[PDB]
Scaffold this active site. Structure first.
Site, PDB file in Angstrom:
ATOM      1  N   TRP A  69      -8.382  -1.931  -0.719  1.00  0.00           N
ATOM      2  CA  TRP A  69      -8.969  -0.738  -1.319  1.00  0.00           C
ATOM      3  C   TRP A  69      -9.923  -1.042  -2.466  1.00  0.00           C
ATOM      4  CZ3 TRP A  69      -8.782   4.649  -0.842  1.00  0.00           C
ATOM      5  CH2 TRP A  69      -7.880   5.184   0.088  1.00  0.00           C
TER       6      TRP A  69
ATOM      7  N   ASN B 208      -1.613   1.086  10.187  1.00  0.00           N
ATOM      8  CA  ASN B 208      -1.123   2.451  10.013  1.00  0.00           C
ATOM      9  C   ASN B 208       0.214   2.659  10.714  1.00  0.00           C
ATOM     10  OD1 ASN B 208      -4.535   3.323  10.527  1.00  0.00           O
ATOM     11  ND2 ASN B 208      -3.462   3.211   8.556  1.00  0.00           N
TER      12      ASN B 208
ATOM     13  N   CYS C  10      -7.655   9.165   6.420  1.00  0.00           N
ATOM     14  CA  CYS C  10      -7.559   9.035   7.873  1.00  0.00           C
ATOM     15  C   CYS C  10      -6.213   9.608   8.283  1.00  0.00           C
ATOM     16  CB  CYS C  10      -7.618   7.574   8.296  1.00  0.00           C
ATOM     17  SG  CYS C  10      -9.224   6.844   8.088  1.00  0.00           S
ATOM     18  N   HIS C  11      -5.249   9.453   7.388  1.00  0.00           N
ATOM     19  CA  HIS C  11      -3.892   9.937   7.588  1.00  0.00           C
ATOM     20  C   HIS C  11      -3.827  11.278   6.893  1.00  0.00           C
ATOM     21  CE1 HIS C  11      -3.967   5.939   8.804  1.00  0.00           C
ATOM     22  NE2 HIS C  11      -4.212   5.507   7.580  1.00  0.00           N
TER      23      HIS C  11
ATOM     24  N   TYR D 217      -4.688   9.629  -1.188  1.00  0.00           N
ATOM     25  CA  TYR D 217      -3.321   9.556  -0.662  1.00  0.00           C
ATOM     26  C   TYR D 217      -2.185   9.787  -1.647  1.00  0.00           C
ATOM     27  CZ  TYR D 217      -5.354   7.562   3.648  1.00  0.00           C
ATOM     28  OH  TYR D 217      -6.053   7.312   4.812  1.00  0.00           O
TER      29      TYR D 217
ATOM     30  N   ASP E 272      -9.352   2.944  13.675  1.00  0.00           N
ATOM     31  CA  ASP E 272     -10.008   1.690  14.039  1.00  0.00           C
ATOM     32  C   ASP E 272      -8.936   0.902  14.795  1.00  0.00           C
ATOM     33  OD1 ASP E 272     -11.012  -0.932  14.170  1.00  0.00           O
ATOM     34  OD2 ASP E 272     -12.033  -0.743  12.239  1.00  0.00           O
TER      35      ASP E 272
ATOM     36  N   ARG F 172      -6.946  11.182  11.969  1.00  0.00           N
ATOM     37  CA  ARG F 172      -8.210  11.746  12.396  1.00  0.00           C
ATOM     38  C   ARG F 172      -9.135  10.685  12.979  1.00  0.00           C
ATOM     39  NH1 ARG F 172     -12.005  10.091   9.449  1.00  0.00           N
ATOM     40  NH2 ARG F 172     -11.722   9.399   7.264  1.00  0.00           N
TER      41      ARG F 172
ATOM     42  N   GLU G 148       0.812  -1.216   0.000  1.00  0.00           N
ATOM     43  CA  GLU G 148       0.000   0.000   0.000  1.00  0.00           C
ATOM     44  C   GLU G 148       0.848   1.270   0.000  1.00  0.00           C
ATOM     45  OE1 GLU G 148      -1.812   1.796   3.452  1.00  0.00           O
ATOM     46  OE2 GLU G 148      -3.762   1.754   2.479  1.00  0.00           O
TER      47      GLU G 148
ATOM     48  N   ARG H 161      11.288  22.755  11.114  1.00  0.00           N
ATOM     49  CA  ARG H 161      10.087  22.357  11.836  1.00  0.00           C
ATOM     50  C   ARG H 161       8.799  22.351  10.991  1.00  0.00           C
ATOM     51  NH1 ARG H 161      11.650  25.674  17.314  1.00  0.00           N
ATOM     52  NH2 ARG H 161      11.911  27.250  15.677  1.00  0.00           N
TER      53      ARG H 161
ATOM     54  N   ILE I 282     -12.944   1.496  19.016  1.00  0.00           N
ATOM     55  CA  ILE I 282     -13.012   0.049  18.893  1.00  0.00           C
ATOM     56  C   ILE I 282     -14.475  -0.231  18.559  1.00  0.00           C
ATOM     57  CG2 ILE I 282     -12.701  -2.148  20.077  1.00  0.00           C
ATOM     58  CD1 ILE I 282     -10.896  -0.696  22.081  1.00  0.00           C
ATOM     59  N   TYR I 283     -14.744  -0.888  17.437  1.00  0.00           N
ATOM     60  CA  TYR I 283     -16.133  -1.187  17.122  1.00  0.00           C
ATOM     61  C   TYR I 283     -16.649  -2.177  18.155  1.00  0.00           C
ATOM     62  CZ  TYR I 283     -16.190   1.429  12.797  1.00  0.00           C
ATOM     63  OH  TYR I 283     -16.174   2.442  11.866  1.00  0.00           O
TER      64      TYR I 283
HETATM   65  C1  LIG Z   1     -14.497   0.200   9.968  1.00  0.00           C
HETATM   66  C2  LIG Z   1     -13.210   0.116   9.205  1.00  0.00           C
HETATM   67  N1  LIG Z   1     -11.999  -0.189   9.862  1.00  0.00           N
HETATM   68  C3  LIG Z   1     -10.751  -0.286   9.188  1.00  0.00           C
HETATM   69  O1  LIG Z   1      -9.729  -0.553   9.796  1.00  0.00           O
HETATM   70  C4  LIG Z   1     -10.762  -0.057   7.783  1.00  0.00           C
HETATM   71  C5  LIG Z   1      -9.608  -0.122   6.984  1.00  0.00           C
HETATM   72  C6  LIG Z   1      -9.592   0.101   5.577  1.00  0.00           C
HETATM   73  C7  LIG Z   1      -8.286   0.015   4.740  1.00  0.00           C
HETATM   74  N2  LIG Z   1      -6.959  -0.453   5.408  1.00  0.00           N
HETATM   75  C8  LIG Z   1      -5.927   0.574   5.575  1.00  0.00           C
HETATM   76  C9  LIG Z   1      -6.744  -1.834   5.812  1.00  0.00           C
HETATM   77  C10 LIG Z   1      -5.628  -2.357   6.402  1.00  0.00           C
HETATM   78  C11 LIG Z   1      -5.671  -3.730   6.683  1.00  0.00           C
HETATM   79  C12 LIG Z   1      -6.841  -4.295   6.309  1.00  0.00           C
HETATM   80  C13 LIG Z   1      -7.376  -5.753   6.394  1.00  0.00           C
HETATM   81  O2  LIG Z   1      -8.537  -5.977   5.953  1.00  0.00           O
HETATM   82  N3  LIG Z   1      -6.547  -6.731   6.952  1.00  0.00           N
HETATM   83  C14 LIG Z   1      -7.040  -8.130   7.062  1.00  0.00           C
HETATM   84  C15 LIG Z   1      -7.037  -8.933   5.777  1.00  0.00           C
HETATM   85  C16 LIG Z   1      -5.985  -8.821   4.702  1.00  0.00           C
HETATM   86  C17 LIG Z   1      -5.563 -10.129   4.080  1.00  0.00           C
HETATM   87  O3  LIG Z   1      -4.749 -10.825   4.733  1.00  0.00           O
HETATM   88  O4  LIG Z   1      -6.069 -10.393   2.963  1.00  0.00           O
HETATM   89  C18 LIG Z   1      -6.276  -8.715   8.230  1.00  0.00           C
HETATM   90  O5  LIG Z   1      -5.018  -8.724   8.134  1.00  0.00           O
HETATM   91  O6  LIG Z   1      -6.978  -9.120   9.181  1.00  0.00           O
HETATM   92  S1  LIG Z   1      -7.889  -3.104   5.609  1.00  0.00           S
HETATM   93  C19 LIG Z   1     -10.835   0.411   4.956  1.00  0.00           C
HETATM   94  C20 LIG Z   1     -12.051   0.495   5.703  1.00  0.00           C
HETATM   95  C21 LIG Z   1     -11.986   0.256   7.112  1.00  0.00           C
HETATM   96  N4  LIG Z   1     -13.169   0.333   7.841  1.00  0.00           N
HETATM   97  O1  LIG Z   2      -5.930   3.480   7.096  1.00  0.00           O
HETATM   98  C1  LIG Z   2      -7.029   3.418   7.658  1.00  0.00           C
HETATM   99  C2  LIG Z   2      -8.290   3.565   6.981  1.00  0.00           C
HETATM  100  C3  LIG Z   2      -9.422   3.480   7.689  1.00  0.00           C
HETATM  101  N1  LIG Z   2      -9.481   3.250   9.092  1.00  0.00           N
HETATM  102  C4  LIG Z   2     -10.837   3.174   9.772  1.00  0.00           C
HETATM  103  C5  LIG Z   2     -11.125   4.119  10.802  1.00  0.00           C
HETATM  104  C6  LIG Z   2     -12.570   4.208  10.760  1.00  0.00           C
HETATM  105  O2  LIG Z   2     -13.081   3.116  11.570  1.00  0.00           O
HETATM  106  C7  LIG Z   2     -12.934   4.044   9.367  1.00  0.00           C
HETATM  107  C8  LIG Z   2     -12.926   5.281   8.535  1.00  0.00           C
HETATM  108  O3  LIG Z   2     -14.152   5.870   8.195  1.00  0.00           O
HETATM  109  P1  LIG Z   2     -14.557   7.293   8.838  1.00  0.00           P
HETATM  110  O4  LIG Z   2     -13.461   7.694   9.802  1.00  0.00           O
HETATM  111  O5  LIG Z   2     -14.598   8.191   7.645  1.00  0.00           O
HETATM  112  O6  LIG Z   2     -15.892   7.074   9.507  1.00  0.00           O
HETATM  113  O7  LIG Z   2     -11.820   3.357   8.810  1.00  0.00           O
HETATM  114  C9  LIG Z   2      -8.273   3.089   9.847  1.00  0.00           C
HETATM  115  O8  LIG Z   2      -8.225   2.883  11.065  1.00  0.00           O
HETATM  116  N2  LIG Z   2      -7.107   3.186   9.067  1.00  0.00           N
HETATM  117  O1  LIG Z   3       1.277  30.186  17.289  1.00  0.00           O
HETATM  118  C1  LIG Z   3       2.503  30.013  17.348  1.00  0.00           C
HETATM  119  C2  LIG Z   3       3.448  30.476  16.357  1.00  0.00           C
HETATM  120  C3  LIG Z   3       4.762  30.227  16.538  1.00  0.00           C
HETATM  121  N1  LIG Z   3       5.299  29.523  17.660  1.00  0.00           N
HETATM  122  C4  LIG Z   3       6.798  29.295  17.776  1.00  0.00           C
HETATM  123  C5  LIG Z   3       7.270  27.954  17.872  1.00  0.00           C
HETATM  124  C6  LIG Z   3       8.598  28.030  17.321  1.00  0.00           C
HETATM  125  O2  LIG Z   3       9.488  28.375  18.412  1.00  0.00           O
HETATM  126  C7  LIG Z   3       8.555  29.068  16.309  1.00  0.00           C
HETATM  127  C8  LIG Z   3       8.176  28.591  14.947  1.00  0.00           C
HETATM  128  O3  LIG Z   3       9.086  28.803  13.912  1.00  0.00           O
HETATM  129  P1  LIG Z   3       9.469  27.585  12.929  1.00  0.00           P
HETATM  130  O4  LIG Z   3       8.736  26.345  13.392  1.00  0.00           O
HETATM  131  O5  LIG Z   3       8.972  28.076  11.612  1.00  0.00           O
HETATM  132  O6  LIG Z   3      10.972  27.421  13.002  1.00  0.00           O
HETATM  133  O7  LIG Z   3       7.424  29.854  16.665  1.00  0.00           O
HETATM  134  C9  LIG Z   3       4.428  29.035  18.676  1.00  0.00           C
HETATM  135  O8  LIG Z   3       4.803  28.423  19.670  1.00  0.00           O
HETATM  136  N2  LIG Z   3       3.068  29.316  18.451  1.00  0.00           N
END
Ligand SMILES: Cc1nc(=O)c2cc(CN(C)c3ccc(C(=O)N[C@@H](CCC(=O)O)C(=O)O)s3)ccc2[nH]1
Ligand SMILES: O=c1ccn([C@H]2C[C@H](O)[C@@H](COP(=O)(O)O)O2)c(=O)[nH]1
Ligand SMILES: O=c1ccn([C@H]2C[C@H](O)[C@@H](COP(=O)(O)O)O2)c(=O)[nH]1
Ligand SMILES: Cc1nc(=O)c2cc(CN(C)c3ccc(C(=O)N[C@@H](CCC(=O)O)C(=O)O)s3)ccc2[nH]1
Lengths: 278, 278
Positions: free
Chosen positions: A81, A198, A167-168, A107, A190, A187, A59, A147, A229-230
């Site tokens: 995906w 991740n 999410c990233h 991404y 899961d 943000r 990925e 920075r 955690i679901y």
């Molecule tokens: C609710 C939710 N939770 C998630 O973690 C999530 C992740 C992705 C994408 N992602 C970033 C993923 C990373 C790893 C994955 C996964 O399904 N792993 C399985 C099976 C893979 C295999 O071996 O074929 C596993 O390892 O259990 S999926 C998309 C929707 C989601 N939705």
């Molecule tokens: O790389 C990834 C992609 C997805 N998710 C999970 C988090 C959430 O459970 C869900 C994302 O959907 P929303 O955050 O948009 O609801 O996917 C991860 O933890 N990692």
């Molecule tokens: O709202 C703000 C704005 C700036 N700084 C400080 C942190 C760093 O010491 C410096 C940032 O400069 P650079 O990260 O660009 O080097 O300003 C804060 O703490 N808060």
């Protein structure tokens, strides 16, 4: 440091209020979390439950290539995906003209062509948008104390075109004493699936950039917005929570690479990965 | 509580590493830190060292207006950005053709017209770009469970145009049990000056949005990338740590405001703010 993870899983299962998700499924949710993972002579590939490493590796290489075509990832045995690029999903989102597998400016596109006008996954975007990935690499090489070494996948404009919001949303790099660290702002996390993946994913990115910039991997700071955690995992994760964390494996990069783009799946070797079954 | 902050101070002192910045002033740095400030019946305006409240409040209302003219804020008694918008400093960045006071596409612009093409401070951007502010406000009212309530100031494209790269890359909002929380991702944090002001700034924004969305202020999660102490502040900070933190003041929104743009400085009153001397 995998304890921090388990801990986070523990904290959510004992102070995490309930909150329904986008779909309808509920989850136990805590907002705002952080865990530090040493990348020093070890790779944070969780041992309390097997992480889909291949998927992680493929990925990321896929993000790096700048691909927004889920088929280019599916071709590697990583279908995580596929559902988001299937004819139906794209249609349910209003992307009727999109070739199957076209995820939109997600991404890969943001990392490499931030700001560029998205056409479709077949389009050439070379020399378009901000190449954030190369910029962080070059900044590290030129001004390590900087920075503002940030790569942001969160693009409000492109948001409506994405076959999913990232999410990233943002990651930041940091260098000190020749050690390269990275912090991810996830943000939404899961805890049961995406999170461990991740963590490994950005730990890998760091290892790669470190290797290309001649630095040593420092730490991977993981920050969570909605850590959840679901409900249906609340017990299984409690099962995992009692599993004994094992020493982290090691990530071996086989060949020296001049540029992030040159890395291939075969340049990476996870060694000593002894994860708990099931 | 303020102890979180003070704890972070001692940690940067006890474990931070020496790291040089742009001015090469030298700092004690730790990468990846997070503090949680309750906004329930109290406002996180630091007591162990006076925080320039008026500045916090005015700059924020200034961000909301979408203003990118420092003269616009300076006339409010807040010169904190004047230096950056001065003919002199603009010329050192190459904006020799830019009208004085014009900071370029900074927070204000990023928050209300994200993605729009920046002209200058005098330009009318209405209808242009994405209005993240209103969007998060809308999403909180219509779908509080949304795990994407983000406001991003970090525009990879606009960054160079800004008098100063954003320290507040992005913030995320969260909602559960009628409580509005907010997490700020601060890439660089000056623990001795900026941070306390930044902490307040977003606490004020959260208090501001909770009021318009009829929610209660819950938590403000402060996440830092490069958290640091400037070496010349090491003595001062050492003293501050001795200080007994006094109860945090309280924020009172006098008028009943319906829209985020109607908030005027007069609508805000800090209560019982006993900042420690000097
Ligand atoms: C609710 C939710 N939770 C998630 O973690 C999530 C992740 C992705 C994408 N992602 C970033 C993923 C990373 C790893 C994955 C996964 O399904 N792993 C399985 C099976 C893979 C295999 O071996 O074929 C596993 O390892 O259990 S999926 C998309 C929707 C989601 N939705
Ligand atoms: O790389 C990834 C992609 C997805 N998710 C999970 C988090 C959430 O459970 C869900 C994302 O959907 P929303 O955050 O948009 O609801 O996917 C991860 O933890 N990692
Ligand atoms: O709202 C703000 C704005 C700036 N700084 C400080 C942190 C760093 O010491 C410096 C940032 O400069 P650079 O990260 O660009 O080097 O300003 C804060 O703490 N808060
Ligand atoms: C090295 C560095 N550290 C900072 O914290 C920092 C902060 C800003 C912007 N910011 C986020 C600020 C918050 C508070 C401020 C200030 O100057 N306060 C005065 C007010 C007195 C007056 O009214 O003149 C003070 O407290 O001394 S400035 C700009 C450059 C920086 N540079």
């Amino acid at each position: 440091s995998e304890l921090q993870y388990l801990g986070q899983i523990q904290h959510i299962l004992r102070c995490g209020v309930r909150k329904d998700d986008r779909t309808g499924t509920g989850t136990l949710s805590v907002f705002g979390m952080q865990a530090r993972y040493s990348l020093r002579d070890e790779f944070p590939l969780l041992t309390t439950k097997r992480v889909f490493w291949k998927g992680v590796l493929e990925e990321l290489l896929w993000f790096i290539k700048g691909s927004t075509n889920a088929k280019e990832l599916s071709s590697k045995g990583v279908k995580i995906w596929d559902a988001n690029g299937s004819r139906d999903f794209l249609d349910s989102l209003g992307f009727s003209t999109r070739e199957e597998g076209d995820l939109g400016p997600v991404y890969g596109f943001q990392w490499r062509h931030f700001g560029a006008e998205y056409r479709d996954m077949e389009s050439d975007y070379s020399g378009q948008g901000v190449d954030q990935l190369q910029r962080v690499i070059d900044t590290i090489k030129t001004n390590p104390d900087d920075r503002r070494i940030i790569m942001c996948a969160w693009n409000p404009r492109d948001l409506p075109l994405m076959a999913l919001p990232p999410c990233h949303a943002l990651c930041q790099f940091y260098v000190v004493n020749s050690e390269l660290s990275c912090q991810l702002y996830q943000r939404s996390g899961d805890m049961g699936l995406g999170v461990p993946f991740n963590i490994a994913s950005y730990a890998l990115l760091t290892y790669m950039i470190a290797h290309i910039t001649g630095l040593k991997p420092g730490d991977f700071i993981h920050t969570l917005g909605d850590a959840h955690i679901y409900l249906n995992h609340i017990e299984p994760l409690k099962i995992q929570l009692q599993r004994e964390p094992r020493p982290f494996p090691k990530l071996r990069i086989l060949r020296k690479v001049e540029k992030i783009d040159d890395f291939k799946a075969e340049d990476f070797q996870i060694e000593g990965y002894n994860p708990h079954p099931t």
